[PDB]
């Protein structure tokens, strides 16, 4: 039933300073400031959370290996699997349509 308060300069209940109450090895209750939770990286096309990539603070990514923040597939770590599949299919079909349109133009200009 012991009351605890902030341990830093800020006296206001702002998002920046949030308090948890913990029992120290001295048998007493004491406050502890909690950091902001990390946010999962999101896909750049659909905005869904990327799978297989660890969730860390922006500056904590500078200290981990590349396998913990990428995926072995192309666009891995930036776009998800379904978006890459759509990109591949769309690019191939667009190229095929360009070929067909070029053949049609060649035929229609071949009359004269």
């Amino acid at each position: 039933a012991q009351r605890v308060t902030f341990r830093r300069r800020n006296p206001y209940n702002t998002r920046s300073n949030k308090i948890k109450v913990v029992k120290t090895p001295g048998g007493i209750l004491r406050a502890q400031h909690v950091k902001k939770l990390a946010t999962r990286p999101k896909c750049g096309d659909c905005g869904s959370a990327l799978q297989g990539i660890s969730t860390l603070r922006p500056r904590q990514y500078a200290t981990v290996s590349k396998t913990h923040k990428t995926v072995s597939r192309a666009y891995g770590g930036s776009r998800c699997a379904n978006c890459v599949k759509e990109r591949i299919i769309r690019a191939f079909l667009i190229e095929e349509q360009k070929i067909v349109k070029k053949v049609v133009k060649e035929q229609t200009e071949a009359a004269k």
């Binding site: 759509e86 299919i89 769309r90 079909l93 095929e96 349509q97």
Partner: protein, 97 residues
């Protein structure tokens, strides 16, 4: 009509409803005709068109949405594409439809 032929095919013939089944049957070469609803997404429609060109399967563009095509087939759910494995008793294949 075209709805009567489709209903007869579902009653007596062999069919596959849906995009995945249609593509699988196109790969296996067992499709005689693919009816495509007008409500289908453009990417899937273009993929089906390319697959039909590869497999030399006749294409019929249904004049209605996936729900109208589902009702024409006789099912209370939407179907986006139908593939006719066997006409059976009907004559949809004979009349170039």
């Amino acid at each position: 009509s075209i709805n009567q032929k489709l209903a007869l095919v579902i009653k007596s013939g062999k069919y596959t409803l849906g995009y995945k089944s249609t593509v699988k049957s196109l790969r296996q070469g067992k499709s005689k005709l693919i009816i495509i609803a007008a409500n289908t997404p453009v990417l899937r429609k273009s993929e089906l068109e390319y697959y039909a060109m590869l497999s030399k399967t006749k294409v019929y563009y249904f004049q209605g949405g996936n729900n109208e095509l589902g009702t024409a087939v006789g099912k209370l759910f939407r179907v986006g594409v139908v593939s006719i494995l066997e006409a059976g008793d009907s004559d949809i294949l004979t009349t170039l439809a």
